[PDB]
RNA sequence: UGUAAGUGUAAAGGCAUAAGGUAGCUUAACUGUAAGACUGACAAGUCGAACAGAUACGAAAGUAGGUCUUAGUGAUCUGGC
RNA sequence: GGGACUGACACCUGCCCGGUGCUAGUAAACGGCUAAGGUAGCCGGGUAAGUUCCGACGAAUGGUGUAACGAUUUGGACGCUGUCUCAACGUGGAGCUCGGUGAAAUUGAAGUAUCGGUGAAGAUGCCGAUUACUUGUGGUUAGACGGAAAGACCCCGUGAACCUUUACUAUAGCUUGGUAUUGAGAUUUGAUUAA
RNA sequence: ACAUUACCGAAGCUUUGGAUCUUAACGAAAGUUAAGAUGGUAGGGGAGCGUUCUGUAAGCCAGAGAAGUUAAGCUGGAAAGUUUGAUGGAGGUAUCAGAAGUGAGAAUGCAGGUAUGAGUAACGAAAAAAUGGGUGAGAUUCCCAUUCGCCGAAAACCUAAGGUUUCCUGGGUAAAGGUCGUCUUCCCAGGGUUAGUCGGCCCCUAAGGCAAAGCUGAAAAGUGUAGUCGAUGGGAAACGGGUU
RNA sequence: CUCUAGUCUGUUUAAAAAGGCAGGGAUGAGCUGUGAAUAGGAGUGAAAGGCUAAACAAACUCGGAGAUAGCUGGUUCUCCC
RNA sequence: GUCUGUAAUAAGCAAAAAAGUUACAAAAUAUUUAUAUAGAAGAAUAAUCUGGAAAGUUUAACCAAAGAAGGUGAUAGUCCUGUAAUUUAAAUGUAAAUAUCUUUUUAAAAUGUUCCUGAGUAGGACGAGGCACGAGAAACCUUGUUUGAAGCUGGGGAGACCACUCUCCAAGGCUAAAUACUAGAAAGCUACCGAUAGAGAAGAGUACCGUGAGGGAAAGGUGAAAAGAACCCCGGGAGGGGAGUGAAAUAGAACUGAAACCGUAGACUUACAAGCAGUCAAAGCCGUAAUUUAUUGCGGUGAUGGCGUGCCUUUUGCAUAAUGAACCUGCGAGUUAUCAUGUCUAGCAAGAUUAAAGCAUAGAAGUGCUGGAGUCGAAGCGAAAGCGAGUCUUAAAAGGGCGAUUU
RNA sequence: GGAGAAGCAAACAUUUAUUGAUCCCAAGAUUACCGAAUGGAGUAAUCCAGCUAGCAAGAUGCUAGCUAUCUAUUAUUUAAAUAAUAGAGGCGAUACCAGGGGAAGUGAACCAUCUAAGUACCCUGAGGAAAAGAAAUCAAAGAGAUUCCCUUAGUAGUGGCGA
């Protein structure tokens, strides 16, 4: 009745350092700062999850304004022809066709003009 | 308290930098005693006596539920006292390779003193049964005077 | 038997029980100088009462037999 | 003119039906009690119709369980009568 | 012989017995100066320029002088000088390089720039802006509210210890009375009880 | 500043996929649907993982490879769990149930190992070393020789107080010597201290201690006479030279 | 031969109280060797709250003792409401 | 029975009972397969496969009053030593029993007169302590200082005291067992420990520290067997490389050998840049699998972009320049015993339940009975007497307080 | 008890053991010196004797045997003095028991009563148990020595009626 067995804490240890390979300097190998390391990760990690849906959308607006530059239509105009005509497509799949596929773009934008 | 060592302060309370101490057997420090570790105390208790007697009545009902496992045998003795006897009639009977548990009606020495020595063998007298046995026998060989004192010890 | 827990004596000689939990007690300030205390005062004093339920698990708790 | 006067004692709230003032009688400045409440952590404190006995005053109905109300006070333990 | 007090020597050492000690008295007692109100005594010069210095409280817990003495304190003069204006040079041990041997305290890490602001209110880590090739060595500490010492000062804890007292409560010791140790005589000082 | 149409913009809202819980309905029940409700310290309630031992277990799995770190991969909503290899060469353990020395990231924690400062400060007094030769695998530091320097009312010599083989011969360099080392007060082996005249012992006493008896105190003892011990003291005897 | 004013080095020093310069005593209240006596609410103190085995406003060791602290610090796996 | 001789009684002798555990003391042997202290006997395996090694795999037995525990080259009832049930005592030690021996009664049932029946003692006064009881009404006992009795026609006690009554007979001295304890000895056990654990100590109060009293560590493991590496090469050696032993020599003074720490080699990135060092995106390079093959994934590196004030503790509030940690690995804190109360589980039920302890079997610190003394409910109210589904406050159920008739 | 033995581990070369070794047990012998240490003394392991016996005993020779003290009992005028036997000295049990001495840290959120507590510890005694033990008792019940348990019971009382 003296339960010591330490067969936890060397598990607990190996797990962490499994997750935490390729840290700078002693964050990858010492227990304490790469349990540190590890868990303010972790929170990022959360938090960035959330915030890739708004850098992703950002993006697809920026590659969008960037694409109308040529025509006259400001993209707060575009937008609005959209609704009002009643296109329901995404930000990312405009985006996406404005690289893929030039002249369909522009040809909802003729008629957006509308 | 009960580890050997002296009780003096091994070093000032302030000014020399380390840590304070009271004495040296301090829990914390190595080779000190054991806060809340064990002491010896009594584990045994007494259940009520009905509550007993119940558990037995459920446990050979249990038994004797299955048609196989739980067998009945006409008296004998062993009257030599040897166990290549005794071992010859469990292994006529007996079928499930484990755990075998007699039943006697009386203290027939012989019996026991021949069976004192078997692999898997427990032999119980019907007045000092133990519930433990009685529920991991995955064999339970008993004689009708067994089964007779059991009827009328458990009857009451 | 080693450890039975004692009963609180000074608080014993105050309290008492009643059948379903409440605790009886005397009331104070009918010890004293009592020439100016009005009669109908004096009167009620003299009359036994009961404690508010907020003490009854402290007095439960000190009188762990009674 | 209509309470600014005066209400033992501080001030406030009240007091014309005067709770102000005077006179006669008188001791309820009682006993056993109490429905129902306010205030309140508790311990405490306060109001109280009404009931029984004994009265006081008044013809009687009724009032009176001190002071117009709101401060004048001290638990428990111990001791004395 | 013991204790207290003063402190070579010289001139002096006064007043007060209420209070508190000691056995009405005692102050060369504690102390004071209504019990008694303190007796004796205790600007000039120096420098061009001097808050320093020199010359014009209190009487046996002592007052005022004093030759000699002092690793004592303070002022001034003479001589002498790197103390200073004012530093430079030289010498010796370290420091510098190499070879051998080889620490310490500290240490959450660090691909740690600055300024203006904000903020547990003095920013290496934030915002804006600016600067900056990478990495060492020899110097110097401005910062990292540097390291070292659970701040020594302040305050708190119904903390601890010591000391004092006309704080409280015990008590050594001292002292008084009674009694046991402890008997026999003589005498009148009485009280009480009756005659 | 006043007007018109907008857009961007949060873990809000809406939609998609999945999970738990409360309520309600359906269903024999299990559960299936509808509604909403789930930030959270103190603190309350509830549900699990994992470790050791015990019964299950004289069971099962292991030398054809147990336990343990160890590389990679995979599963579970979290605690985590188990497959293949390397290493390892001898015991672990399913299910159910019970019992705790039952889970560490810190207490200026304890113990041990190793970084950091850092090849940095020091390497211990400003009395000073230099050349040649010998020994040795190896010489600025050992030995020998010739110069120089230092102490010289000592840094010299002879005896105490103390140390206790540190002394001599021979051999050797793990460590230790603040470096090196053939050397050492280091290590190993062997050897070495001869008393009538020295110092003690001894016969005497100073201070002091013990102390029959006596006396005084709960005990244990405290005082203290006769005595007996107690040297740095007082008392018989030796000097020179040589030898290892 | 015994002492330490003044100054300096030193102060993670060679030394847990020295050394480098200097000064006082130096025939006496002298220095010192070798023995012995005084022990903790006590001793000793040419008198500074000093010393008594490098630490003394009550030595050290052991035991009571794991003393008591309204003070500080620490208190280890997970999920749901 | 002052001397002799008689009615009439003592001192010795037949006859019996006890005694070294109190009761009188001192022993000594025989005798007890009783015991303590050396011992003896002691059951029942062959083949096959893997492997260095079998006890194991597998196929078949045998023994068992012995399948308790160890060792045996990997895991043994039958290999060895032991184990069950039996059993060695010349000598020595400890126990009873029997006689011997020692001692005692060598007698009792029986009425009233006298003697004694425990003396500075019982008690009282004052000052203290022990009794659960602190002067409180304070008994009683011991006891220091003082005082001081009765003599069975008696005295003590019955919680101040008095009376009656009921008990007991002090001031002399012994007494085994039940009970406390284990430094230790032998035989055994463990939901006790396995080298920072366990006694401080697997090597010991040693090394070391202090004048002394005293304080006090750290250090276990080759291999189945040294079978300790002949010989050869480098080197002064050490050590290493070969050759051999061994299943293994990254088993060679040591098993399994991690983390912290120090390295080597290969791949990628980096010397115009202000990164709590991470996360979310992402070109290029390298490794790799598919898709006929250079575009998608598993990967390792990562230019560049966006976001981001380490952690713990403490505070109204901290990145704070408040506190704490050099890192890493071990060790390192709500436990146990009883009582109260609440809940859950199990059982019985107006009842529930035994504690100590005993017996039986076993040797198996069990568990089956025996054991009801005691406790908690079943009636409460009132200070109590006492009364009772009522009780108390009061002349009053007259109103309430505490109850209940619905446990 | 039977074939090895020369300790706790072997090594290196020497013997013993079947003539019964080694070893285990029982008994006996030997049993230096110090130590209760006891002839005196003393810095414990050592110097100084008195007497007797043997060493050629002898000039500080060696060896063996006696002379310490207290108490009880008598050989005497038990005090003094020796003589005679008998019982003790000290250690062990960092256990237990009896007698004597007797705190302090705490709690009472202080403290002075009280508590802790007859606790620790000191000292004097023996035993294997000790102490106590055969009613001038318990106590209002009819019991009958002493001691140790289960209950009575946290009850009866006590307590700056505070803990």
């Not at chain 1, 960037?66 to 959209?82: N, P, Q």
């Not at chain 1, 405009?94 to 522009?106: G, H, M, P, R, T």
């Not at chain 2, 299955?66 to 010859?88: H, P, R, Y």
């Amino acid at each position: 009745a003296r339960a010591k067995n330490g067969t936890v804490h060397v598990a607990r240890r190996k797990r962490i350092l499994k997750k935490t390979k390729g840290f700078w300097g002693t964050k990858k190998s010492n227990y304490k700062k790469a349990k540190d390391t590890l868990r303010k990760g972790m929170m990022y990690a959360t938090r960035d999850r959330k915030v890739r849906k708004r850098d992703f959308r950002r993006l697809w607006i920026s590659r969008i304004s960037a694409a109308l530059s040529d025509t006259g239509v400001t993209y707060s105009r575009f937008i609005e022809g959209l609704l009002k005509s009643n296109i329901k497509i995404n930000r990312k799949i405009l985006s996406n066709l404005a690289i893929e596929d030039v002249e369909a773009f522009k040809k909802i934008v003729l008629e957006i003009r509308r | 308290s009960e580890v050997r060592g002296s009780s003096k302060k091994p070093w000032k309370q302030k000014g020399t930098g380390r840590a304070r101490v009271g004495t040296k057997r301090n829990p914390v420090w190595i080779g000190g005693g054991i806060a809340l570790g064990p002491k010896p105390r009594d584990y045994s208790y007494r259940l009520p006596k009905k509550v007993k007697k119940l558990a037995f009545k459920s446990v050979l009902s249990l038994r004797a539920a299955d048609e196989n496992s739980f067998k009945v045998i006409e008296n004998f003795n062993v009257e030599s006292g040897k166990t290549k006897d005794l071992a010859l009639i469990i292994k006529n009977f007996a079928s499930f390779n484990g755990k075998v548990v007699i039943l006697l009606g009386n203290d027939d020495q012989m019996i026991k003193r021949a069976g004192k020595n078997i692999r898997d063998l427990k032999i119980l007298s019907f007045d000092k049964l133990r519930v433990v046995d009685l529920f991991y026998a995955k064999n339970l060989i008993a004689l009708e005077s067994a089964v007779n004192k059991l009827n009328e010890f458990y009857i009451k | 038997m080693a450890n039975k827990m004692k009963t609180r004596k000074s608080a014993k000689k105050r309290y008492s029980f009643t059948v379903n939990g409440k605790v009886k007690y005397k009331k104070q300030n009918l010890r004293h100088i009592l020439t100016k205390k009005s009669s109908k005062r004096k009167r009620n004093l003299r009359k036994s009462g009961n404690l508010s339920c907020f003490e009854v698990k402290r007095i439960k708790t000190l009188l762990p037999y009674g």
